[PDB]
Paper text:
An extended sequence traverses the protein between helices α1 and α2, termed the PPK loop as it generally contains a conserved ΨPxxPxK motif (Ψ = large aliphatic amino acids V, I, L, and M).
PX domains are found in a wide variety of proteins with diverse functions, including cell signalling (e.g., PLD1 and 2, PIKC2α, β, and γ), vesicle trafficking (e.g., SNXs 1, 2, 3, 5, and 6), protein scaffolding (e.g., SH3PXD2A and B), and cytoskeletal transport (SNX23/KIF16B).
Residue numbers in the entry: 1181 to 1312
């Protein structure tokens, strides 16, 4: 009844020195299949810019800006985690509603599986550190 579930349960520190940055643990579930990808903010933002020019309705979504107080402060990172989570959830909400989308709700007896999502955007494909 609710075909695509997503959460961001935690964020992890990657890299060493000043090249160290945060990635977000994205847990995705479609039907009864779950997998997890690690994605930094930049990758979310590029995903949004890329997909917005292909599906105009996404422009009604507010993407979270990166915040000028303290990239060093984990409280900032935690707020960002919450916001990215809400964003992904709304992203799929819109993509389930929009008729010209490959994700649209009319495929939910048919062709919507891990595969539809993974192909829909390289953002959701299992790459290196990602896992199922």
């Amino acid at each position: 009844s609710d075909p695509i579930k997503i959460s961001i349960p935690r964020y992890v520190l990657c890299g060493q020195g000043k090249d160290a940055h945060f990635e977000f643990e994205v847990k995705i579930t479609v039907l009864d299949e779950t997998w997890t990808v690690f994605r930094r903010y930049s990758r979310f933002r590029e995903m949004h810019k890329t997909l917005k020019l292909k599906y105009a309705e996404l422009a009604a979504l507010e993407f979270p800006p990166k915040k000028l107080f303290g990239n060093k402060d984990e409280r900032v990172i935690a707020e960002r985690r919450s916001h990215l989570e809400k964003y992904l959830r709304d992203f799929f909400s819109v993509m389930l509603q929009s008729a010209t989308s490959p994700l649209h709700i009319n495929k939910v007896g048919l062709t919507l599986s891990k595969h539809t999502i993974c192909e829909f955007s390289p953002f959701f494909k299992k790459g290196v550190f990602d896992y199922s």
